[PDB]
Amino acid sequence: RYAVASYGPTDALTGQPLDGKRSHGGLRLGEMEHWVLTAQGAMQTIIEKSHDDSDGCISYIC
Amino acid sequence: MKICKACSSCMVRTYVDGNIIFRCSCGESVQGDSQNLLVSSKVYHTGEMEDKYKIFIKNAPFDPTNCQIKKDCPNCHLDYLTQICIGSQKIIILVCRCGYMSNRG
Amino acid sequence: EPWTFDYGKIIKTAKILDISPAVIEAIGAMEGRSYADIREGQGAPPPPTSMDDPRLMAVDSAVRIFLYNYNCLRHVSTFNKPPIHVERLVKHLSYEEKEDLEKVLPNVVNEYHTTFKHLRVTDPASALLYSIEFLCISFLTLYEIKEPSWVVNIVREFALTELNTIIQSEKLLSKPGAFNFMIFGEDFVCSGEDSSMDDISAYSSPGLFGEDIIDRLDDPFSIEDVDISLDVLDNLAPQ
Amino acid sequence: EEINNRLLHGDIMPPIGLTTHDFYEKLQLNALKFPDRILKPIMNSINPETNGLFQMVATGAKGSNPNMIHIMAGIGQIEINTQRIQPQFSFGRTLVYYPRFALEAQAYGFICNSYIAGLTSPEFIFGEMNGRFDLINKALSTSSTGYANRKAIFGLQSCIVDYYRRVSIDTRLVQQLYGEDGLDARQLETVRF
Amino acid sequence: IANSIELITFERLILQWHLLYETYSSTKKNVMYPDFASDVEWMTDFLENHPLLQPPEDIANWCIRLELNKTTMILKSISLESIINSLRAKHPNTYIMHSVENTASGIPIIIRIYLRESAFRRMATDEKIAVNVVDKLLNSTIRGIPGIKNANVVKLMRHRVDAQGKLVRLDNIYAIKTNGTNIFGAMLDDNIDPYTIVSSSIGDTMELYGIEAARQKIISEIRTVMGDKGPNHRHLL
Amino acid sequence: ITYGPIETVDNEELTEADMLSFISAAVNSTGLIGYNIKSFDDLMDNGIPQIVKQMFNVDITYKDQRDHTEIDKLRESVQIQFNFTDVNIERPQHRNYSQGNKINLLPNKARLCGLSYSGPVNLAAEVILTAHYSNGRQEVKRASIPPFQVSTFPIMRGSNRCHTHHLSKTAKKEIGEDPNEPGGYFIARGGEWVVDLLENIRFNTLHIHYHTMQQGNNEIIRGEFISQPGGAFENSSQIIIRYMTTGAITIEINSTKFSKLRIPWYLIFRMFGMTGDDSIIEQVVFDLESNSLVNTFMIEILEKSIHVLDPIFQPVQHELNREKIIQFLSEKVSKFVSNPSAYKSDENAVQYLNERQLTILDKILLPHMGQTADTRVRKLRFLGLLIHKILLVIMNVFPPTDRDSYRTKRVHGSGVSLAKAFKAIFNTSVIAPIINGFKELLKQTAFEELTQRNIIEAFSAALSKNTASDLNRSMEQSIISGRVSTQSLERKNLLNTISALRTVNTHNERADMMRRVHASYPGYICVAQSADTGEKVGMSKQLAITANVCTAGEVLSLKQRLLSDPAIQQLADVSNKDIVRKGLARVFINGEWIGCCTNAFELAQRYRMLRREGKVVHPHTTIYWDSMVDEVEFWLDVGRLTRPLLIVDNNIEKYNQACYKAAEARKKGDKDWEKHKIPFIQNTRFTPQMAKDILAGTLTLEDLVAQGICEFITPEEAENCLVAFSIIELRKHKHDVTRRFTHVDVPQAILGLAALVSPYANCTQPARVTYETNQGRQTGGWYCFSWPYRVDMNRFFQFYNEMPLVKTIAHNYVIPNGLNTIVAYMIYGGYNQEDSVIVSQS
Ligand SMILES: [Zn+2]
Numbered sequence A: 001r002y003a004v005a006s007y008g009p010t011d012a013l014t015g016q017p018l019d020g021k022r023s024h025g026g027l028r029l030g031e032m033e034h035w036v037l038t039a040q041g042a043m044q045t046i047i048e049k050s051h052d053d054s055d056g057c058i059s060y061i062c
Numbered sequence B: 001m002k003i004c005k006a007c008s009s010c011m012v013r014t015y016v017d018g019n020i021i022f023r024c025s026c027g028e029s030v031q032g033d034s035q036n037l038l039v040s041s042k043v044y045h046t047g048e049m050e051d052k053y054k055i056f057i058k059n060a061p062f063d064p065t066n067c068q069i070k071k072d073c074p075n076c077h078l079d080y081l082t083q084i085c086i087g088s089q090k091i092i093i094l095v096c097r098c099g100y101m102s103n104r105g
Numbered sequence C: 001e002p003w004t005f006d007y008g009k010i011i012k013t014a015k016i017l018d019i020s021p022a023v024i025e026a027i028g029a030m031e032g033r034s035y036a037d038i039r040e041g042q043g044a045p046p047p048p049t050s051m052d053d054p055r056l057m058a059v060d061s062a063v064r065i066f067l068y069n070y071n072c073l074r075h076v077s078t079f080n081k082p083p084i085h086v087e088r089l090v091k092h093l094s095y096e097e098k099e100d101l102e103k104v105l106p107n108v109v110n111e112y113h114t115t116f117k118h119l120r121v122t123d124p125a126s127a128l129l130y131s132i133e134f135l136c137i138s139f140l141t142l143y144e145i146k147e148p149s150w151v152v153n154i155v156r157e158f159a160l161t162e163l164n165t166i167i168q169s170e171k172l173l174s175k176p177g178a179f180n181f182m183i184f185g186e187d188f189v190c191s192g193e194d195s196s197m198d199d200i201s202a203y204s205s206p207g208l209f210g211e212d213i214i215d216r217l218d219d220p221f222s223i224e225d226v227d228i229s230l231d232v233l234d235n236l237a238p239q
Numbered sequence D: 001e002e003i004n005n006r007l008l009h010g011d012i013m014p015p016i017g018l019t020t021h022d023f024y025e026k027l028q029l030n031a032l033k034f035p036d037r038i039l040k041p042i043m044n045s046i047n048p049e050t051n052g053l054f055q056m057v058a059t060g061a062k063g064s065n066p067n068m069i070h071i072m073a074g075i076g077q078i079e080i081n082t083q084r085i086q087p088q089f090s091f092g093r094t095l096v097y098y099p100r101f102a103l104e105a106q107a108y109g110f111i112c113n114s115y116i117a118g119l120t121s122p123e124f125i126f127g128e129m130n131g132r133f134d135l136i137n138k139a140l141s142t143s144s145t146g147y148a149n150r151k152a153i154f155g156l157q158s159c160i161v162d163y164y165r166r167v168s169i170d171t172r173l174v175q176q177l178y179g180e181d182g183l184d185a186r187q188l189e190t191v192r193f
Numbered sequence E: 001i002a003n004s005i006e007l008i009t010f011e012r013l014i015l016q017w018h019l020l021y022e023t024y025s026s027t028k029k030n031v032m033y034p035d036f037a038s039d040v041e042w043m044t045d046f047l048e049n050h051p052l053l054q055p056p057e058d059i060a061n062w063c064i065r066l067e068l069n070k071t072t073m074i075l076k077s078i079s080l081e082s083i084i085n086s087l088r089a090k091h092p093n094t095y096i097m098h099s100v101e102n103t104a105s106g107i108p109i110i111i112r113i114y115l116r117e118s119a120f121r122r123m124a125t126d127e128k129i130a131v132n133v134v135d136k137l138l139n140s141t142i143r144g145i146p147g148i149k150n151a152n153v154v155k156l157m158r159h160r161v162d163a164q165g166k167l168v169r170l171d172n173i174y175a176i177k178t179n180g181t182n183i184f185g186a187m188l189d190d191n192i193d194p195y196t197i198v199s200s201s202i203g204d205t206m207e208l209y210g211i212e213a214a215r216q217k218i219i220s221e222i223r224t225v226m227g228d229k230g231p232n233h234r235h236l237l
Numbered sequence F: 001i002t003y004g005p006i007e008t009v010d011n012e013e014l015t016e017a018d019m020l021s022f023i024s025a026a027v028n029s030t031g032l033i034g035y036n037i038k039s040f041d042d043l044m045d046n047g048i049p050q051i052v053k054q055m056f057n058v059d060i061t062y063k064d065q066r067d068h069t070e071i072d073k074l075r076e077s078v079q080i081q082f083n084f085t086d087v088n089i090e091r092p093q094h095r096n097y098s099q100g101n102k103i104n105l106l107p108n109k110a111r112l113c114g115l116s117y118s119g120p121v122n123l124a125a126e127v128i129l130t131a132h133y134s135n136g137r138q139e140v141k142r143a144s145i146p147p148f149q150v151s152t153f154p155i156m157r158g159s160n161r162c163h164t165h166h167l168s169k170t171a172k173k174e175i176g177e178d179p180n181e182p183g184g185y186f187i188a189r190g191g192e193w194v195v196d197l198l199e200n201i202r203f204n205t206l207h208i209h210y211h212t213m214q215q216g217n218n219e220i221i222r223g224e225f226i227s228q229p230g231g232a233f234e235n236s237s238q239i240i241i242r243y244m245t246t247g248a249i250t251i252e253i254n255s256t257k258f259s260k261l262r263i264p265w266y267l268i269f270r271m272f273g274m275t276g277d278d279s280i281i282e283q284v285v286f287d288l289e290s291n292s293l294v295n296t297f298m299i300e301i302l303e304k305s306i307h308v309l310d311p312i313f314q315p316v317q318h319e320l321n322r323e324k325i326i327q328f329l330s331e332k333v334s335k336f337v338s339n340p341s342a343y344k345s346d347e348n349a350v351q352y353l354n355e356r357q358l359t360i361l362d363k364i365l366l367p368h369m370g371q372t373a374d375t376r377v378r379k380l381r382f383l384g385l386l387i388h389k390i391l392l393v394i395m396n397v398f399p400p401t402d403r404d405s406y407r408t409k410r411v412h413g414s415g416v417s418l419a420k421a422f423k424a425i426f427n428t429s430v431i432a433p434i435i436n437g438f439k440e441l442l443k444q445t446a447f448e449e450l451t452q453r454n455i456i457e458a459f460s461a462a463l464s465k466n467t468a469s470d471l472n473r474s475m476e477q478s479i480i481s482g483r484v485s486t487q488s489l490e491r492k493n494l495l496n497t498i499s500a501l502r503t504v505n506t507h508n509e510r511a512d513m514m515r516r517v518h519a520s521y522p523g524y525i526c527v528a529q530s531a532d533t534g535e536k537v538g539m540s541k542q543l544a545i546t547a548n549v550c551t552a553g554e555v556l557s558l559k560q561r562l563l564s565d566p567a568i569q570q571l572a573d574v575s576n577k578d579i580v581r582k583g584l585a586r587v588f589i590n591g592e593w594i595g596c597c598t599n600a601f602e603l604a605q606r607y608r609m610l611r612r613e614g615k616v617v618h619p620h621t622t623i624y625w626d627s628m629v630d631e632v633e634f635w636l637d638v639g640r641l642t643r644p645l646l647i648v649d650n651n652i653e654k655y656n657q658a659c660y661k662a663a664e665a666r667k668k669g670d671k672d673w674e675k676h677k678i679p680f681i682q683n684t685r686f687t688p689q690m691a692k693d694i695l696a697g698t699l700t701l702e703d704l705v706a707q708g709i710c711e712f713i714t715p716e717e718a719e720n721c722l723v724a725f726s727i728i729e730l731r732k733h734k735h736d737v738t739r740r741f742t743h744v745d746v747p748q749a750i751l752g753l754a755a756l757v758s759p760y761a762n763c764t765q766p767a768r769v770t771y772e773t774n775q776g777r778q779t780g781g782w783y784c785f786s787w788p789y790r791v792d793m794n795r796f797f798q799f800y801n802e803m804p805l806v807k808t809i810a811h812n813y814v815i816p817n818g819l820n821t822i823v824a825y826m827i828y829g830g831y832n833q834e835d836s837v838i839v840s841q842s
């Protein structure tokens, strides 16, 4: 069993949480979960989980 | 098959023109004739039965793993007989250690 | 009709070739020995004791090389491009002479192959001795032909050069003499027992049938294209 | 055994398109099918008003009729890719326990005993071959379905219903109407005309 | 009709064939294979019986001899003349000779097909192109629609409208189901309805019929692959 | 040694519960673990010394000098030959500062500190150095290295090199170990690792497979052959005989000295002599006077094969001079030759190339038939036989080899895998540093300056400043990562440990067929035990309950015995023509075709009887007689999977005599021929008294194999056996002349240890048995009895365990883990739906 809060170790490269419970942060919404959420037309849970609870950043384009 | 009488090497056919003459790398020729006229052959349902399984059929009476039937052997009057099923045709051949063959091999 | 070994023909052949008879009698038997050892005749392996002796095969190969070269010489007219030796030997002859060569030069192959096989299956040592005797007989009976003169010169040159190259090859198969190993262009030279530079990739024995063959398609048993995490693969259990 | 006897006299003539071996295999597969009569002894020894296993099977709660027949009456014929056990052990031997060119039905996967009666050693081996084939297929399922599903998903993912209820890729049409009726798949009822 | 539509290739009508380096321009002596020298008794009987097909002078020196198995010859019931006409029509580079369909049940029907000089028109060895010729002859279609490996009669379950307007469902309808798709040959044949040809292959439907028929065929194939508890029809659409 | 008449045996009271006694006897004899321990012991006793001494002989010449001294100006080449002949492994020792006190390292101490249970290897070498000057000058320098040790090889737990070898259970408890565990694992960096059994194709066997995968479509049927010159530690060489779509039969030899170069078969044949194509064709097809259809087909195929061209070997295709072909191979396959035109003028260079080429070809081309030039013709005969077999398969006379069959498979564990890893690692991590150090001191120190003492520290110091592998980090990395099957020792319970020690791994339609239950598994591989999830299914096999793994037998003793038999005509006496004319049957020992017997069945029967006696032929030898090809194969190599099978004897001789007497009475016309016919009787000589003795301990499997009651049957020989699956079936066919069995099985012998834990398993669906074997290895319980001393990770110890109320034979050897819970099969509120359980809180 595992449960993680909104803070924890984040990957140095991608900014994403680490892998699994052993690294004290993670659990994954892989390709299939994104397909399912899109099929439901979520796009606000996808925003939340993939950006706010993951490597969220604000790019700037000229 | 044709082997050079000099250096014992394979001889190419080289059909020229109405007659076949064999050429070696050393140059000797042998004048193939009559029989050598055949080039290639293919006969369907051939290469099995009495040539493919001759060893196996010969050894079958002495193989303990072969199924045996309750049929009298005409040659030696042994009560039991060795039974074989061969090929896609499921040809049943009955053998014996005496030498009986059921005339199926 | 019987046969027996005649050492006199071997001695005559060695004299004509100005080398010791120990070299002629040791054809196919100088492996692992130096030529200086061959000339003295010492260390000669005993007569072959079984049909499996590679010496019989070696001497038969020598006789076969001789007969093959002689057959190229006999039928030069039938070659679009004859090999180097015959072309060097026959370049001065006429086209009519080249065609007549098929008629003039004797058929020296005789019944060699069949009776050699019979001897080898029946007696190996006599088979080796007969192979050497037949090689000597063929070489001299081609040498000691007398008529006509032009074929005499051609056949004498042929026999000398081809027996010389046979003996030279047999000496090449023998143990090398002392020499510098610099010829081969590398900073080092291996050996026949080089456990130092040995492909360790083969030390790990190929204990599988189809190793060289390469499969590139996706393995139909992997999770490479499926997306599940560990301890969540338990959901893929039976039922 | 009658089919085998006809084979002993060479009385089996295959139809055109099938060899004697394949026709013999088909004939034996047909001859060893379990008749529907097999339910009679099972149902005679079952009290349907109180038998828990039968009430589970009959009401559709769990299990099927073949499970009940296997448990109580007999397994019958084992099939691996709609054919009996091929003699893989040796030339003409299905198992070490059976003679070469064996003609009895038991040698090729016929299980006379039921699960409750207990399976013998070769019957258990044949059942294990069948079960392992099932496990292999189940394990193949995840991988093959994942490959095909990902390919299909990336083929179709761009198809989005637009404001005209057409299915369109970017702006290029894929469909004039979604199901050709424009209806969600969750809002359909089957009614007779 | 199923038997008629099935493809019957020449290789299936032969028990053995021999490629020989001999010719039969007649006039000259012979030069014959030893075991085949007995053929002369009918080689000349063919010239007597068929005086309109004398051996051409441009015959090559490459003959292939065929023996026809009468059991499968009468099983599928092909006349020898039909075989000979199919071989002759499909090949003008060979001069066909054959025995007589005597129905003797003891002597086999022999066809000797002699290569012509025009056949050796190819950059390749004469023997090798002759060996290509025999293989092509063994592949030549004799009867049936090409690519139709099999054909089996299956009763179908179909709906029809009666004179009273009732939609009756007929089970007596019979039609054949083949292996291998060649829609074009099926349309050509007259015993088969051309407008009700159904093929399991999407490619042949695309080529023959068009893209709408190909789309419907895709739906049908995906549906029959789906099984019983398949998805909705709009997903297949 | 005649036996008592089978008609007088009484077995009617022999029940299945008595056959369980025979199963127990077999398990006790094999020990259920001892194969790996004894394999490792044999490794460190016989293999590693032979691997270092015989196989590792160095001979390399360097070419670089310093242009200062006139001796250094007249010198170009220096040749060094050093070979170790002294080696031993002593038990692990702990020394803190690596020397001094030299106390014995204990396994618990190694585990606690993260140490390694490794022992030092003391080596001594004879080093011979020569420098080859110009103008034929040569001097020799000889050095004798004192016995020294720079290595530590990991030592398994339980071998005689382990300190717990013959320790008593009380003394094991004192040393802090587990009294009941058998060992079998290596203690590396504080962790226990088990080298699993790796299944490998059988060596010295022609594996023929069609390439029907249909990729690289140019290729056709390929018949490969891995040739091992002797024991399992030897350097094996592989030859691959490929039939191609172009008609070419090309032989590719892959070995350490030389690999990956496709060569036409006639070339390989004629560089050994016999350059006449007639002789080569005769060797392949064994006879030319017979026409046949088999001979005609092979003859035409070989004619096409020789006639067709080859791209790479173009110059020598028609070269009838074997010397030119040898030189071509030497310059194409030998390294260090970058100038083809350089050697074209030196005679000595060509002589050396030819000598080295003949040496490598002798050692590389079918080494198992010999490694001296006197056996080249028999090597050619065997190569012709292999080509004949492949082409015979091509004619559809025979089917391709069965990849999944266990007739041609061997389980190599611990000894063999570590032997090969050791040879590769030792080669690199010893030769490369030593050779580079010798080259460096050569570059610096004057050669004639080196004294006997100087070379000694030259050799010792070069293998002292080494940290690349040290052999220890490398051996540990091989053991951890893993052709050395490995698995972290998962201490879930005792059954998990044992099953890990009994796991057979592959390390290789191929995905499907290689996971099915093959028909050769029964008796040797647990038909039930396998994985359940993902690709692991069918990947880890398990040994059956009675199956063990044989060790290398007396190959030479049996070979000499066969060669002394009057009825075996050696290869020298019989030629291929004599083989076909008389229909002689080939005799093989370990794949080495020696001799030809007149009657294969008679020879096999006689030697099987002799093995049954046990004094003259070891019981573990495999005597497989192929009735299809009329061959007798004797096998004594390691990795064979024997199991003990009770022997069924009958009175077929007396039955035949009575039948013939009845026939003569019928011929004489007497109607009383019935009284002259006797009933056929077949039985096993196993009596209930032997079962009771087996349980009583007065009789073991050794006494059974000695008496001839039972015998060990390998899969190869199992194909020659007709086994009754139970004593019940033998009793049923006790008077049936149509079911003359050769052995009687015990049905519990077909299941593994984990599968036998399931009670009434045959009443269950077999797939459920498989998931039980999966789950029987995961249950918590008394995994180890020394748990307080160990520092374990993710290990669960269950206080209470109970013997099952319905126990099985698998609990006679493992400790039950679980309780006899009273379970009500009922619906209680729907909280146990879909594989849930309602547990009593109390
Ligand atoms: Zn020639």
Ligand SMILES: [Zn+2]
Pocket: B073, B074, B075, B076, B077, B078, B096, B097, B098, B099, B100
């Ligand atoms: Zn008889």
